[PDB]
Ligand binder design. Sequence first.
Ligand SMILES: *[C@@H]1O[C@H](CO)[C@@H](O[C@@H]2O[C@H](CO)[C@@H](O[C@@H]3O[C@H](CO)[C@@H](O)[C@H](O)[C@@H]3O)[C@H](O)[C@H]2NC(C)=O)[C@H](O)[C@H]1NC(C)=O
Lengths: 640, 975
Amino acid sequence: PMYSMITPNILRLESEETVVLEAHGGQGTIQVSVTVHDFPAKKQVLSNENTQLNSNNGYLSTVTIKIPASKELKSDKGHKFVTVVATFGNVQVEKVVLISLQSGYLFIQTDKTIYTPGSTVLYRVFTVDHKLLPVGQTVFITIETPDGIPVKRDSKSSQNQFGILTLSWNIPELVNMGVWKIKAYYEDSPQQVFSAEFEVKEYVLPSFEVQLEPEEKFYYIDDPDGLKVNIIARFLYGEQVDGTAFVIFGVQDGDRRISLTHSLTRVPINDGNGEAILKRQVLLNGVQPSRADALVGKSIYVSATVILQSGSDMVEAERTGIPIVTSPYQIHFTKTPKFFKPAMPFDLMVYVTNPDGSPARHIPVVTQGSNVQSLTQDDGVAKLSINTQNKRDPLTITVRTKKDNIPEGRQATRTMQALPYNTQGNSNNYLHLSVPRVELKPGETLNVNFHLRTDPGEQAKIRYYTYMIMNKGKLLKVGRQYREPGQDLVVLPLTITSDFIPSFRLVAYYTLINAKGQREVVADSVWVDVKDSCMGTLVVKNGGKEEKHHRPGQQITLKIEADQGARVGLVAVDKGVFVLNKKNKLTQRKIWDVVEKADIGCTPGSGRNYAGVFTDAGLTLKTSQGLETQQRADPQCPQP
Amino acid sequence: QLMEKRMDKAGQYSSDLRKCCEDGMRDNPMKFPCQRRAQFILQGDACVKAFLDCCEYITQLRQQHSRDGALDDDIIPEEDIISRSQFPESWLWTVIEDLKQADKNGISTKLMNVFLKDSITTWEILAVSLSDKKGICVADPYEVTVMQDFFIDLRLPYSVVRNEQVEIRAILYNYREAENLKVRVELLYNPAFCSLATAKKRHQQTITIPARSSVAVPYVIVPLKIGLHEVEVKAAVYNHFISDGVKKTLKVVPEGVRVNKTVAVRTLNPEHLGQGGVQREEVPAADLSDQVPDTESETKILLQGTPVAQMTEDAIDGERLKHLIQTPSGCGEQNMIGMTPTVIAVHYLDSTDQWEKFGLEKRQESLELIRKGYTQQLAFRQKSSAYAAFQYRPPSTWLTAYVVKVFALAANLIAIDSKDLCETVKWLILEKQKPDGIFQEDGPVIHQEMIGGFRDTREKDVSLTAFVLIALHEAKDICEAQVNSLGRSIAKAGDFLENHYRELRRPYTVAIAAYALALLGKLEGDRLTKFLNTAKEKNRWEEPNQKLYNVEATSYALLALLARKDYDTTPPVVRWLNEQRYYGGGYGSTQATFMVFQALAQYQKDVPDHKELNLDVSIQLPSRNSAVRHRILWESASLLRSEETKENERFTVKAEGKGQGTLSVVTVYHAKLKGKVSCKKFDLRVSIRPAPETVKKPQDAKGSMILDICTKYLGDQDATMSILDISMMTGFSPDVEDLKTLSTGVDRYISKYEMNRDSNKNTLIIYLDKVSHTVEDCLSFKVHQYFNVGLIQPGAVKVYSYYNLDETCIRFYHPDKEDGMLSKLCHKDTCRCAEENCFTLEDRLDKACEPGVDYVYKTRLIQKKLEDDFDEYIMVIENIIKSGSDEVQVKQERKFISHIKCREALKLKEGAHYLVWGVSSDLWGEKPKISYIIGKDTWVELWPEAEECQDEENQKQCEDLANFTENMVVFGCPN
Ligand SMILES: *[C@@H]1O[C@H](CO)[C@@H](O[C@@H]2O[C@H](CO)[C@@H](O[C@@H]3O[C@H](CO)[C@@H](O)[C@H](O)[C@@H]3O)[C@H](O)[C@H]2NC(C)=O)[C@H](O)[C@H]1NC(C)=O
């Protein structure tokens, strides 16, 4: 028989971590003891647990260990390790694991993202642990100038406020203007500084606002008519503007402003409407190289001073960042896996974006050569399944957008290369996990397809698949999916709960004894999105009748629904600030962006070998036959 | 075609030289020629040559296109653009913890009733939860749109004047796109106002507002009383439940300028200034020759147990801190009021252990003030860690030193960035110190005493090198290991002042260099005897024609003597500095106040002979039957006791006991325009006139005018740092785009402008780097009138040096008599309602014998003096019918004063005879000159001449007036 031990490759101190124990071919009852020792001396048993392997659990059991944060492990010199030893009766299995205490998360929410002098910055700091549960610890909170000078250093304990540090600060009337920074760190971890930024500009009271709407959200460099920009000028109280707009165009050359002086036109504004056109001959001559290709990758800015007809007020606005490209889309292969399986379909995930970085919705993309065509959704991602041949050659894939009313020279096109999985001893023993692309919400049920491909003498030896579900760098669910002989497709139904948000990895494998008498392990993994929801629940609704328009000074009733014992922090903000600077405002996706960076996997699936699957997904393996994984030193993954 | 060549010419220049050329092509409101605008350029000759080339380009090119234009130039692209940043303030900033009531799923529900704000906007309520079993969760946003469709905007002024007459607009908005709104609008009655709404009849108007439109409804209102009065306008929509009301407060400022007046400052020390242990001080009555008619005066007597007791108790209090200094802040040195008095008040109460009197929080509340002033002073920090006085000016070495001094003192109390402080120090040693120890000023000079004058190259840079050295000695321990040059630079500055000390001649420069040597122990020998012999009368280091500068010099000298441990020499210097409170009982400017506070607190710091305080002071006012007594002991709570009186009388203060104290007597009154005719060291000319019709004016602005202000200093050098204090007339507010042009350019004429809130009238403060002593410095900008005002009261322009408040000059400006700006905006009943304050045989005998009637005269008007505020009527008393409290004679002249409202009410004729009687409370002034007030209990009746009495229409009145005169002298009033 073969005994196997699977743990996550980084174990957290003061945390419940899951150890998987499994006896391939066990008989009777096998008592297993798991011991955690200090590295490299093994002088102290840090954790000790017990379980059994029998026929009732299928010779597969899990063990929860909690390594305490001792004074030797808290030392700041060198990456520390522990040694986990599992004893399967008389056979011991032993693996050295990297450790990290972590338990550091600080989220900062300002009440708004732009301020005038004299305003009050209302800001909250939420103090949670590694499980995102509230902790009561001392936090040092620093407000810094745009030049970086600290003007306010607070120290607040979140023990009695239970994790919601609610504070305020008054901006003085004379102050630095620019991008201010709030910084926060725990008292026991000063090197983990978390930050949010806000902007302080000056008082602006327009009698009328000016909006510069270009006809397209980009400029085609081979467009003969040019770039039309609609001038929409209206009062803040709603009325229309009659007057005269003085409009000038220009080129933003990276970090360079080139004023097009020959584009300066006088435009009348009648009933709040006017039009200024930048002709193509003004754009080419005004930039110092008069090349259409040397204008690609730049943007057009446009400034317009609108005067009222009685000469009464002038309000000037600017629309920057209108790109001078030929393709309105950018193809990205960032959400797709980099490794394919031979003679099995490759789930290509093409991410199509607008030139400002926003996701391009409902854009048809076609792969060249295979003619697979799909549409993007609201997230900008399209799924194209490419049927691969039974070859271990690198698969070169070119994706091209095919939206109508756009010429073929103006379509986005990008090329990638996918690499094949390497089997043991050039054998035909493969595994492929096939998952349908649904925006998975908690409450939906996912059917996962377990495809087998083996040599015909090796097919009957496979009785089960052993699957593992990981979420937030922890083993969430382990089980077995059994298989009758002759079943080339086995389906595991999986209910998505709230513990799967934001994303989860499913890793599955089978073992066998091949035609050379050697123990072969074949594995596969897949990364699945979950719709950005919440581990708990928090809704704010109306408590009275659903009135569309309210009056000033009207009493309304708010209905606030949360979990039992939850503390809810509130703010009522004007809508005009929420839309302005969105990159500094706390959203629910920004919670799920932060935990997505803290993960122990680097690739969205597959690997170089059997040890390539466990290491790329965040696991490690040690078997009694000698099958193992490499050691992890760095929690990060390299980029050029 | 004109913006075309203006940008092709500006394209010829690059980098910072293009900004000089583009500013040469801008319009200038005073129409200076291109060579005159070049005189204000501070950037150097390369910027001036690019300025002149582009200025004279479009000067001759506009005069060519105008002289062939018979047969706007709105190009401010900026490239930066400031967008919308003012939104309504966020609310509902709470945390809810009562959520334990579980359902089947454990979901807890909270209901909460909240009130919406008055902002017509879409509110948006955001929620972040935190649960001990479920973690953090941010909700989706919940939007609450607030819209009433009909809303009212009430347009009030900043301030009106009592018995001035305005038109107030309520703008009513209606935006139903295609549905019009018939609305009745009502102005509510207020007895402090005088309008078409009375106590028995409301003033209702019925209007119809069109769809997607606005209608303004005017209301004419006369305020009759002084103080914060509410204007309430209500309006409700016909056949609907839509109703709105807007209530706003109309501040009616008293007429005239409000002038504080120090009557007396005295040192209270009966051990040294007492005869037989009893000190007696007589305080005179204040000179109220320039007082506004029908306003009250208010004398405030202040007794202080220590000479530092006012400044300490006012620097801890946050609102009282801003009223130590009488000048505005909002520039580089001036902004240090938020730090420097609060630092040395905490340092004083540190060294004397005295916070047991105050609250326990009072240290921590005052520590927050120094943190706020640290954030405010950091706004003036430039990019090279240096400090400039204004936002786009080159850095001042004098200022950057003074920031090092106050930051090093506040580093013991507040967390000051040491690295930034020593980087600011490292800029002073490397960039600004000459190798012979001299610190060089390459920015514009702020303080007057930082120039070595004329062909005395002696005393050149001595006052500045001393000022930097005091500052670097304060940051000696803070920037010790940070800057390895600080020990050598402090000694090099100390060697330069010691070697050049024999050449010094002015009392400020002898004193400020002595304290820089006293910190180094180098005020011995001939440096010591020159410092002591410079002092006049063994107690002050003063020079003629200097006020605040002398207070700084004596404070630097007191700090020099206390650093030398010369405690026996210092008590006369302490007593002198204690009583130089010329400006409202305080020291007026900033650097005067921060220096005498530091010197006086340093005396009480290391000479703690105040624990034996037992001062028994008694004040005897003649208006009170019993003398006020106060006892100030050392423990006895507050060390300051005050008394107030409404009478401007002389009184005697008697002090007994032990200790050294301070008496302060300040009279607050409203002053007219006659006392402001005196101008000292400055010269000022102001004129206002209506703008041309081709001038673009704002939409809510009814008229526009052009204000020209020209000033010139009358000294031997240019006046560094002066302020123009310009009050707007009622309804007026200046053009922001003119003031932005005058403050943003390489040809910069105004260092910074600001509008001063919490003031009497709407006041524009203009900051100037210099005022030329050779050429008259002029500036023009537009002011805009925003509603019709019936009897406009004149504005005021006051120029003064910031560091010497004696060097001031005030001028008043009013438009023309032909403007229709004096014509009463009222109709008839509203006119009469405003003429109550101005003012048949048995009826005359009763009204001349009412209890309170003092005098009855027959007068004759010789001369009217029509002034801007009040009318003087010089009358000759031709008959005395009832003798009053004023001892008058027949054919003796007396002044009769009425308000400019009463010019149409009275309609007096020069030369005509009049029967006048009034009350004794309308007597004003002190004998030999009593002025008479034509008030609401004063009778004015025309007496016809002896040729006019021969007409049949006047013969009954002349017999009624002759019967009244004989009855009132022979019989008098009935008993
Ligand atoms: C002239 O000197 C006097 C005395 O130092 C200054 O008087 C101060 O005036 C302000 C506003 O007029 C007073 O504030 C008011 O305080 C009362 C309570 O006393 C409060 O009810 C009001 O609502 C208001 O806040 C202030 O108390 C008063 N200070 C003193 C010591 O009397 C005056 O500002 C000086 N004028 C100028 C032009 O410098």
